[PDB]
Curated annotation (Swiss-Prot), chain A:
This is Regulatory protein rop. The gene is rop. One of its GO terms (molecular function) is identical protein binding. It comes from Escherichia coli. The lineage of its organism: Bacteria, Pseudomonadati, Pseudomonadota, Gammaproteobacteria, Enterobacterales. It comes from the Bacteria. Antiparallel homodimer.
């Protein structure tokens, strides 16, 4: 990857981790409405990170 | 509550990150990745919307 590609990979890694952290926070709030969306959010973040990692990592 | 506001703000920060990463991927040759990021961003917008309705 170029430097720009690596910056995008790093940001995808960050969102993967940050979405896991927000999911845990919502689960502690027993905020089911939000945690339901957050789980799907984190799944897409994981998918994107793995996709970027394969390509530029 | 402090805990609720922490989660709302984190949702907003994730929304900003997902918009930023979708734009970066669109700027790169990254169709496969940008397609995923479109859905990722729609989820971050919906989570922020929902959390704002509840805790804003």
């Amino acid at each position: 990857g170029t430097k720009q590609e690596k910056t995008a990979l790093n940001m995808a890694r960050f969102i993967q981790n940050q979405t896991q952290t927000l999911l845990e926070k919502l689960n502690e709030l027993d905020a089911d409405e939000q945690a339901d969306i957050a789980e799907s959010l984190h799944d897409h973040a994981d998918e994107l990170y793995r996709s970027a990692l394969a390509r530029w990592g």
